[PDB]
């Protein structure tokens, strides 16, 4: 069944998420021949989690020497050494501070000569390892996942996507508030790619995600709220802060707070 | 306009109600010529409030030597010394334990020769005092007030009412679970009579009152939920326990919890 | 406050309305100096009601010798002896079969030299009688009243109105299915005119009126459903057939069906 | 796919359910080697059906000499000869009045030394017969099935469950209205166990089940209403009384009333 | 997954649908041994599309010399040469004006001696060709498909159906507005038959279809709205006019309007 | 009753508002003895209107000589010459560029020795002129008006208000993104003060105001959405851009778009 973890502060969400990733890896006991495969996102709430994971690694609570990562997405036609590329985000905020092997980091390359070939290569790389064991991600204010469109097929695969006007505006702040400077296209994993993971953990902090949280927990599966499709996943975890609880009914928070005791 | 007091336990609800009545009386400074006029109901939750008022009176925190009371209702064709009459409920559980003057207790007489004249005398008696300063009451699971029907006119007056099938069944527990023994009619104040008070305090405890609480706080005015009409009252107070908050949104409880402190 | 009469067939709706008009007249005991003032509409369901009223008059159960009528509306620039005028509908189907005095029939004149002057004369005529005691009417699928727009001011008065595209289409069947032949304008009473009546009885038969009936009975007051504003009227009666109850909940019909019996 | 049978009285509900069970058995024509497997619940609503089933047996309209029964649940650490055990409920109200073979009655044993082993033995016993042909059951006010929590996996199996505070409160009436006297744990079939039956008949009587019936018939599949998951079952039957129809739309009751007869 | 094409006029809807059928056929490049298989409906909106298909054929933009058609339904016990039979509708409005081979026209025969045998023969004929490549259809005001009941199993097959009271009334206009003159039964494809097609194009024109469009586009899958089940189809296309958009939210139309351009 | 003006761009919203203010003043023909009284707010969309009003003044299309203004609010314990004070906002962006007389500019003083006396003088000053002829304002994301709380009494008066946590965060961007630097309290007009104006024009631009616009146009009056109470105002105007329409139904936008043209 769906696991809903209602918490109060964004730090508690990040600390909980990091702890969950630690426990799965440490229970899995990964080796070189049998690595743990981790799906990873970008953004503000992930950032706090990566920071917590670095702190836990600096202690003696985890090693990434046998963790393989796959990232959700990357901009197209943007140099991968650009400060605002998703390559740069991952290496600067995470991979450069942990003991992961450089050949176990997978991030879509948006500068290939053939974007379809690159997307198929990504899907193949995942299959070569078997399956992603834990995919961490976020959710949009409209319930969309990664750069997938809000009404995306639940069996969509990794493909090239044209960024929406709203996505262009949202990300403008990373490119000098210039909509014309945001890359028009990106490579993203599909909803099917996400659903193929053994466990999907979605992190939702902020009042702007409260409607997405209501759709995920209280609503029925709606094909206009991609996050609601995770209700059909065998292990769907949703962690949220108090601001994102504001649209739920009192009985909903009561039920899940007490279940998690 | 509307004050919503969300509390946890039924005990806290009665204590809050008792304290509020104390403060209203003690601020008002009643005299014999200028008494404080209190509207009073019957039932389980009021009983706890009357008990707390008695304890506060014994603690010399209040005197009723200048409080005039009006009760909501009384059965018709039931001897007023019968255990299950509302005369008996009020005197045995409250008036016989406080310093109220016997001539300041007003309760509808359901044994008159003329129920319309009796109801009219009651409305006149209130007018002779000016106005009820604080009317305490409860609310039905369908939002009805006193013996008024769930679709009662917002200008209904004191009148005779035929008890509903649900009310007959509900009150059967007081007459040996015999529907045939519950009085068929009762004299009740109208919704207009209630709204004419200077302040209306409604007490709502129980999971069975959660939908009525949602209608009063979150919903628009609906003529099928009489309690919602109190939204237009100049001083409408609603006190409720945890079980009755369960249908509200987290943001609704949050807003009013913080306002009151 | 609101009376809802849920019936099965359109015949039952018409008979109930006729009986109600009969009973109001007979209780009022009208005289020449103090006549009973009746507001009247046109249409299919009214036709059956007028037929039933004629039968009751022939059965000497009522006299209209002291009833004054005001009609809702009339086409502009249509000869008043034209078959499709509302003058013709009223006289041919009703007034020519009863004992009403010819000088007590009031119908807006859509052939005046000054429609604003004409509309003002109509409002003045009504005030000269005091108030309409019972106004019968229908309701549009969008809850609109007469030729008033669905968002009409609740204080709109009798005025000239440009017929909507939907009203032109609906009424084409009376002019050889030719939208170009329907009069473009009409003189209509306002929503304020309707609410000034002592009692408003609206008759709603048909599956296409089920949403309007739901808005009037179950919904809160919405200014886009003019019929719902009648919830705040002192005597609002709504009579409907089974097809018009299909959007209501079983509890709504149960409460009112048992109240009326 | 889904059959909804709306009736008026609890007697009609029990009569319909009993007849359906009769018809399935008699069509199946069970033998000793190929028995009919019947799943059975506990509670007030089942009781009337069991009484009706006894009467139909007395009327020689059915024989249980070749029916094998499996019950949903039983208390743990309560002697099975205790008046309030479900063993006692089934035997006193049903099995002691019909011709079932004593070795064909299966009820979870809450007094074993190994509750997991007992639960597995129960699932195995079902497997040994093939599958349950008809599972009769009730529904909680929150749509839960048997002792499963409203957030149980739709593939949950027979297991030990800690009774919720709500179930403890509900069941206090059988243990002197004392929450501390209700057994803390119980053995219950899972939602998966129920869904593995060839047909599921849910019985819903009472005003307190109106919201649950709305969730099963009118709502989409919601993972917080276990009863709504039965919409995906190949043969889902829901029988309900008039009090449980109160939250449905008139069009829903109309549709199914006409379809079923 | 789901394609929603919001257009303005009914003409544009039929023109779009015709063009889509043309393009599917021309890409498929059908041969006699490998024909293109087309599913076809009856009604007002299909009529305009067939007219456009005839115009495009005269313009030599398409040939049906290798198109095989299957129709949704046909009346029972009505001579197939009757003006109001669906045989007549299809031949008069379509087949008599195109170059389809007469042995490639498939329409259920409601005059067989064995309606179950006929329905199985129809299902078998579809199987003999493999699958329907494109199924065009309409939608009822309650979201039902063909003569399937609004609560039909999503795996229903071609079968005989008793026409509902509402269906009898709707079709009365073709039989002298006499409910008793409409055939009581019809042969119809099942919902499973429709879902087995490679692509399903539903056409929805009219204000009376706006609620069904909202259920298909905005709502979750509801087993009382058959059209909503098409959300789970691999290629579901819904084309509608402005009147059918009136119940959608502005953001819904905006999203899909921009997607298609 | 209520005018809803749906437009596309924020420029059009400000231009319409300015034009409306122009036309009201010019029709009124104000003199020194009989001035036009204008209520004014602060914020981004108002600023664009003030620029347009200055442009219209430079074009000699209006004079503000005989115009008296009243502002909604002002911070307390902030020097009125501070860049971020509302005194500074109004003078720098409006009053210093028009021909208003310095003795006709009214703005609450948040630096008085007695804020209650200060509030009363403000209400009295309004009464001394008679009534505000046109009050322009904005609306919060929760429908709140000025610094009034979202559940404010509809008869609240000018008073001191403690800024909510949300208001502190929102305005932090004007004080170096420092919540601790935003003044804790503010002087604000009450909801009653707004309703006492002869006309209320609310301007709503932005996707974050779409829910407030839906509450004002489509919803019933809710005491938790202050803007919805303006439905009972004699002349309530709401102007909005395309981003703020996104939550309305297509039929709502269609109706009012056609009404205004």
Numbering used by the authors:
A (entry chain B), B (entry chain E), C (entry chain D), D (entry chain C), E (entry chain A), F (entry chain F): 0 to 260
Could you give the paper's own sentences about this structure?
In bacteria that live in hosts whose terminal sugar is a sialic acid, Glucosamine-6-phosphate deaminase (NagB) catalyzes the last step in converting sialic acid into Fructose-6-phosphate. The enzyme NagB exists as a hexamer in Gram-negative bacteria and is allosterically regulated. In Gram-positive bacteria, it exists as a monomer and lacks allosteric regulation. The monomer folds of both HiNagB and PmNagB are conserved and resemble the E.coliNagB open structure with seven-stranded parallel β sheets surrounded by eight α helices.
HiNagB crystallized in the P 21 space group with 12 monomers in the asymmetric unit. The structure of HiNagB was determined to 3.0 Å resolution with the final refined R-factor and R-free of 0.194 and 0.242, respectively. HiNagB forms a hexameric structure (trimer of dimers) similar to E.coliNagB. The interactions between two trimers to form a hexamer are similar to that observed in E.coliNagB. The cryo-EM data analysis confirmed that the hexameric architecture of HiNagB is conserved both in the crystal environment and in the solution. In the case of HiNagB, the molecule is a trimer of dimers. Interestingly, the trimer is not symmetric. The angle between subunits A and B—is 120.6°, 116.9° between A and C, and 122.5° between B and C. This results in a complete 360° rotation. The combination of rotation and translation results in a slight asymmetry in the interactions between the A, B, and C subunits. One could say that while the protein’s oligomeric state is hexameric, there is some shear between the subunits.
